[PDB]
């Protein structure tokens, strides 16, 4: 694959998740240490949800760096490579940037619940996905994930949207320019996966790392760094 090996272990993709480590630790620092002048009730809760999307991403990264966790799927004459510290970092940061969405938009408990339910079963579906065993089940899954992502999109762009604006210019912008971000980025992860090892096998796992690493960064560090820069943090929040 594309990249170099790092810890000579056969793993050219390792420079990339050496490299995403490193910016998830920055990123996790940076916010902590902005984190420790602010007194405001709203604004410590962004930031404690916050500094958690980059916290545990460095995590799962070092795990992945350092190959725990990572083991082969047979599909008929090849051997996938699956990292499943990837999906358990997607599972719990993907509810948390939602949650960041959610307490903008000061929306109820019951849609935050269908929100995270339906991210959820996006990440399970998806790691079903990379586990199966036939091109027909990897598709199918995928399609599924794929569909749930949708929902979630719609969602944001519809309904939590509505509910930013009425709180008001300072919020409602920041709130957009997120969701902007969210719509764009988000999208870009299926189309990944589905043209990289896990789908049709156009792109090699090296580049694959690297656009994932590219991804995460910039939907995890660069949101963070877009939403705790904001005065809409300073506003009323009411937690789930
Ligand atoms: C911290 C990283 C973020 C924001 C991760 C987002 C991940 C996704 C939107 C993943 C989506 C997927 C599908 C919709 C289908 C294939 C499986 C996934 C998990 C790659
Ligand atoms: C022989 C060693 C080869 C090393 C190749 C280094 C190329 C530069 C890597 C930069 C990766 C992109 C960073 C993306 C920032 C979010
Ligand atoms: C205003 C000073 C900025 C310092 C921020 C330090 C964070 C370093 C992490 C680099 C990751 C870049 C992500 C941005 C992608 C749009
Ligand atoms: C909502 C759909 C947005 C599509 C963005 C495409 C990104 C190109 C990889
Ligand atoms: C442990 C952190 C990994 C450092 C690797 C740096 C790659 C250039
Ligand atoms: C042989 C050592 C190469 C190290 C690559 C680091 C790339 C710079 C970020
Ligand atoms: C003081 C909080 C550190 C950042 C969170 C790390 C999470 C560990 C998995
Ligand atoms: C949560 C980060 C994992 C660190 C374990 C390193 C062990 C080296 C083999
Ligand atoms: C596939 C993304 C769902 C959003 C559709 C509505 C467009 C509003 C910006
Ligand atoms: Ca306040
Ligand atoms: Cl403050
Ligand atoms: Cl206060
Ligand atoms: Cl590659
Ligand atoms: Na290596």
């Given at each position: ?39 405001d009730?709203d604004?410590?809760?962004y930031?404690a ?8 991403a460095?995590?799962?990264y ?5 190959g725990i ?19 358990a970092?997607?599972?719990?940061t ?8 959610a307490?903008?938009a000061?929306?109820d408990?019951?849609?935050?619940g ?18 199966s ?14 569909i749930?992502?949708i929902?979630?999109?719609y ?10 604006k ?16 969210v719509?764009?980025?988000w999208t ?11 789908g049709?096998g ?14 995460d960064?910039?939907?995890?560090v ?15 929040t009411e937690?789930?």
């Amino acid at each position: 694959q594309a990249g170099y090996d790092l810890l000579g272990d056969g793993r050219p993709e390792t420079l990339w998740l050496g490299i995403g480590t490193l910016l998830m630790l920055i990123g996790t620092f940076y916010f902590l240490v902005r984190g420790w002048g602010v007194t405001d009730k709203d604004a410590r809760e962004y930031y404690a949800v916050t500094i958690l999307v980059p916290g545990i991403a460095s995590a799962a990264y070092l795990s992945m760096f350092f190959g725990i966790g990572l083991t082969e799927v047979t599909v008929g004459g090849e051997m996938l490579d699956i990292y499943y510290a990837r999906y358990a970092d997607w599972l719990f940061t993907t509810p948390l940037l939602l949650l960041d969405l959610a307490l903008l938009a000061k929306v109820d408990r019951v849609t935050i619940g269908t929100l995270v339910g339906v991210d959820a079963l996006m990440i399970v579906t998806g790691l079903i996905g990379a586990l199966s065993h036939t091109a027909i089940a990897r598709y199918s899954w995928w399609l599924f994930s794929t569909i749930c992502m949708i929902v979630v999109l719609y969602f944001l762009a519809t309904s939590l949207r509505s509910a930013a604006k009425e709180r008001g210019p300072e919020v409602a912008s920041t709130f957009n320019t997120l969701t902007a971000l969210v719509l764009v980025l988000w999208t870009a992860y299926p189309i990944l996966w589905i043209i990289g090892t896990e789908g049709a096998g156009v792109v090699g796992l090296g580049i694959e790392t690297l656009l994932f690493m590219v991804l995460d960064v910039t939907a995890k560090v660069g949101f963070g760094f877009i939403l705790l820069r904001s005065r809409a943090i300073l506003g009323d929040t009411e937690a789930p």
